[PDB]
From a paper:
In Gram-positive bacteria, nitrogen homeostasis is controlled by an operon encoding [name] (GS), a dodecameric machine that assimilates ammonium into glutamine, and the [name] repressor. [name] detects nitrogen excess indirectly by binding glutamine-feedback-inhibited-GS (FBI-GS), which activates its transcription-repression function. GS generates glutamine from glutamate, ATP, and ammonium by a mechanism that involves the initial phosphorylation of the γ-carboxyl group of glutamate by ATP and the subsequent incorporation of ammonium. The structures show FBI-GS binds the [name] C-terminal domain within its active-site cavity, juxtaposing two [name] monomers to form a DNA-binding-competent [name] dimer.
To ascertain if this is a conserved mechanism among FBI-GS-[name] complexes and to elucidate, in detail, the molecular mechanism by which low G + C Gram-positive FBI-GS proteins bind [name], we utilized single-particle cryo-electron microscopy (cryo-EM) and solved high-resolution structures of the Bs (1.96 Å), Lm (2.61 Å), Pp (2.07-2.28 Å), and Sa (2.15 Å) FBI-GS-[name] C-tail complexes. Notably, the Bs and Lm GS proteins in the complexes were all tetradecameric, while the Pp GS in the complex formed 10% tetradecamers and 90% dodecamers and the GS in the Sa FBI-GS-[name] structure was all dodecameric. F Density for [name] peptide and contacts with GS in the Lm FBI-GS-[name] complex (map contoured at 0.55 σ). Peptide density was evident for 8-10 residues of the [name] C-tails from Pp (IQGELSRF), Sa (PINRGDLSRF), and Bs (FRQGDMSRF), and 5 [name] C-terminal residues (QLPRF), in the Lm complex. These [name] C-tails all form a distorted helix and bind within the GS active sites. The [name] C-tails in all but the Lm structure contains a glycine at the N-terminal region of the bound peptide (XG(E/D)XSRF). The corresponding residue in Lm [name] is glutamine and the density corresponding to this N-terminal [name] peptide region in the Lm structure is poorly resolved. The SRF motif is the most conserved region of the [name] C-tails. In the Lm structure this arginine contacts an α14´ acidic residue. In this regard, it is interesting to note that while the Lm [name] peptide binds with lower affinity to its FBI-GS, the most ordered part of its C-tail is its SRF motif, which makes contacts to α14´ and α15´´.
Residue numbers in the entry:
A (entry chain K), B (entry chain J), C (entry chain Z): 6 to 10
D (entry chain Q): 213 to 444
E (entry chain A), F (entry chain F): 2 to 444
The structure:
Amino acid sequence: QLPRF
Amino acid sequence: QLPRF
Amino acid sequence: QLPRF
Amino acid sequence: TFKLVVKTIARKHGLHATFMPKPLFGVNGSGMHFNMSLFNEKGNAFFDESGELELSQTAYHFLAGMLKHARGYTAVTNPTINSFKRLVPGYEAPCYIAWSGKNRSPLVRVPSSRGLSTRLELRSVDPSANPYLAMAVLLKAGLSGIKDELTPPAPVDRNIYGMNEEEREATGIYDLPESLGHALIELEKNEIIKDGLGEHIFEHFIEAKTIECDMFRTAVHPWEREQYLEIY
Amino acid sequence: AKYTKEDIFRFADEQNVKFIRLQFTDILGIIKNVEIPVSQLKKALDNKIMFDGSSIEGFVRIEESDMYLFPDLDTWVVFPWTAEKGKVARMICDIYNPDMTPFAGDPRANLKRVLKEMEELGFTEFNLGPEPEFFLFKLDENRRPTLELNDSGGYFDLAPTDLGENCRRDIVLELEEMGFEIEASHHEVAPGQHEIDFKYEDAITACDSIQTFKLVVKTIARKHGLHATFMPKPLFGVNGSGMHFNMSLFNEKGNAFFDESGELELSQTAYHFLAGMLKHARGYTAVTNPTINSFKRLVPGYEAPCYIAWSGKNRSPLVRVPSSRGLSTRLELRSVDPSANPYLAMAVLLKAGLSGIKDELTPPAPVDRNIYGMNEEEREATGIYDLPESLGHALIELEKNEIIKDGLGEHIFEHFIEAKTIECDMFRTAVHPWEREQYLEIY
Amino acid sequence: AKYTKEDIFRFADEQNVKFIRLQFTDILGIIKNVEIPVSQLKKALDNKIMFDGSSIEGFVRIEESDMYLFPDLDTWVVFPWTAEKGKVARMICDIYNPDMTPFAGDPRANLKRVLKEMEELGFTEFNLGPEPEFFLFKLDENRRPTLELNDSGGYFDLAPTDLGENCRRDIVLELEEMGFEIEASHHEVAPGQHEIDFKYEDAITACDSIQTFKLVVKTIARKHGLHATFMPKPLFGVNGSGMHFNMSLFNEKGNAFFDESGELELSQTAYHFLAGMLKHARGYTAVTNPTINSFKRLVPGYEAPCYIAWSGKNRSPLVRVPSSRGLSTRLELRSVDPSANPYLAMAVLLKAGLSGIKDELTPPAPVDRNIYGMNEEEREATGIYDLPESLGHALIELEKNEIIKDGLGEHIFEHFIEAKTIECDMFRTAVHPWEREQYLEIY
Ligand SMILES: NC(=O)CC[C@H](N)C(=O)O
Ligand SMILES: NC(=O)CC[C@H](N)C(=O)O
Ligand SMILES: NC(=O)CC[C@H](N)C(=O)O
Ligand SMILES: [Mg+2]
Ligand SMILES: [Mg+2]
Ligand SMILES: [Mg+2]
Ligand SMILES: [Mg+2]
Ligand SMILES: [Mg+2]
């Protein structure tokens, strides 16, 4: 869901 | 127009 | 007279 | 395939090939101008020897559709934060919603070639965009313009950059979104672009781009330190 | 017609070329080109290639304009330094409007128009022989040019000698191999300065040969770890680089400048051409010397011209008449430098000479008394006048003269004036290390 | 009369001075001096010291000429940085011919002559307040100036702060100790640029204070490992250094520029002075800006004047009228730079104002519409004209104007033109690294 963050 | 400047 | 040049 | 091959070959010769819209400040950006033409059974649908500018009514409807929803699909055609750094005046990148045959950085340009080579050029697209999504949204906008038979605005050739924002907002000239967040808002407002993208793609694209915008907004850049660490 | 389409296709097939550089020259004189694979060659020969014509305007371009790329078949040249992964060939191309009309802003098209006017007046051809001079500098570790010359030679000296090096010999050998008509080659007055002379061809062919010569010389010098520069005055206190033009006008009978029964064995046409060239010299000085560095060369004591006068034998005259006669009768203009655009310079010179012929002007008497002997006031009484001392004054003289404007065309004149005024403004507001060395400590 | 001979002898005895620098100013503005032991002081006070007057002519001197060295008693100043092996004192001296007549080639004598003319017309004194600006650069290991500024300050900013350094504070403290009337001191727009303001004194006293201020600032900056420069434009793209002159004319009643019943509370004398100053500005621009670098400062966008106009509140006017009135009424000329000779500039400005008063010229209407908004053509229709863009044009304007020649004197005028034409030629023929970076690989 949020690997970037 | 002005890449030099 | 001209030692600058 | 061209992106992949160019990157591989540049890596072969000890180089890095980048398609970032604006890798450096104060220098020209990178664009991916699209020259599109629509064909039918007879031939080119944009060509008409008896029409004004040798352009068919289909071409004018396509122009009207492309210009009407440009604020809508600007997010899809420029999906990165770095993209809107390219859309600044003075570097030949488009900044206003207008079309012309010969002007300094128009949003849509009509090349002088005619016949089977008649086409419309959109200059706001950058290499970072997804080609499939950009083509889908552009085709949807043009198709909607054709179906609604919208009349395009008169072309501008008076160097719109000459006037201020207020002096040109009186006419039909409008500004493109200045940031990815505003473009995302415009996407969330427009319905035809949503129909052209599909619910699944629209939702996932919006989620990813909102995450990207939030990540960029809360970051602290060295620009801020160079401007305020010593002053304050 | 030296080559046809079938000849070009046969050459491309047999020499195994995979890249073609359709090249042209902008207003500023920079060689530009569009690169196409061999598979597009047929389309290139159909005059169907589109490109951005605004690049011809240089950096002062504003709006993108589509233009055609009519190539010239006779300019087909295959480069030798292309390895084995396909060869590279070039053809100089003409620029045409989308309405099948030659572009007025193209220097080559402007030269063709001026030549058409000359043919209308009654002449056949305008033969030109240039004498370009260039400097050779040693490269640094990072392949950057330095200020060190390759040799401390002399005028006509056997300085490079045998046993390797001798970049002039390699350059002339490869030029001969590429198909260039080289008359002679020698060392110039300045150390590291070399001159190579050409054979006399037509105006357009001579200009194309000049551009190709610059490109080839730069490439070959880079091959041997050297930098070849055509800057009019790279160094202070040393002789500059010139591109003397030996021009001759021909008609159906033969050389129009030759007359066995005339004074100095010169025809009345030659005298009218001299009068026209001298009358408007102050006008086209800007075109023939388009850079700021150019007017650093036009200083007394280095054989560069400084006064508007003509002679058969004098120390640095503006126009010189070589002693050769017959079919070799010609007039030499010495104010031109290698930095100038050959097409624009030829156009303005031809316009001035044609105007002189039409008006039948009487040239002033030649001077042979060493005009440098007197002061400016003592020679201003006679017809001797000074050339412009800076690019701004030359630009003003251009803006005043009308015949040179007609010979350049409105588009080229406006864009040239804009670019040169920007260049002058950029140079004027800069702060040079000379100023710091002269005032930082004193004041 | 502030001091007498006996006072000078008493000072020399009590402060234990062993060296006296009899100093003067040449045409080019360089401070020169003859050094004598204290034992010769009596002879120095007898006006019997001989020296070579040709040094006043600068580098263009030809023949040695003997001249006297009449000192000024009121200019006695003892330097503090002299250790204990005897102190050093100076007195500004007048130059006199061997026939007991003041030398016409001395700038101070010329200023005295112009002041005598002004007193003949009816006025008493010409008060002047200068606003000199200077740059501070860091020295290298070999005690050579570099291009790095001492601080990245701002306009009126508290940039140097406390806790050491603050060279401006030390400079103003030592100037106050030496006996200087300092009004204020602040940081200028450019980083590393500082301004110190003076009190309003007589013309001669103000010029002497300017010269002493330059000397003291340079010495103190060298003490703290810094280089203080008064170059008009040491760096490109940054604000230049100016020496705005606030001048006021006095009579027996009081300030001649003040009139409560006049428009803008200005007398007719002030308007005549404005008309004279504006009419001949193109004439004395050469004298007020004598270096090549000076005209690099006179460019738009850096608050330096560029057009001949006056205003009470405008972006960079040539002449500005401060809002203060009464005895503080004055006219400010902003085209002067620190490199100018104070005596020559004051002489030419006084001559222009006096001519305007005598002719009763009507000044043009003030401009407050941001003349920078229009183009050159759109403002040339009105009375707005451009200042000379180069030293050569300014020298031509000098050679045309006659009133400025009368205010300078034949000797000073001839020697100034000679020296400055050499400077122009020296700069014109030089090859700068700008050209070797714009046309090297390009051509
Ligand atoms: N010459 C051009 O039109 C280049 C356009 C520019 N590179 C862009 O990204 O839009
Ligand atoms: N010997 C010569 O004539 C050389 C002339 C000189 N090199 C020039 O540039 O004009
Ligand atoms: N703030 C100012 O007025 C500074 C003016 C500028 N330093 C000059 O030299 O003219
Ligand atoms: Mg395009
Ligand atoms: Mg030669
Ligand atoms: Mg020659
Ligand atoms: Mg100030
Ligand atoms: Mg001021």
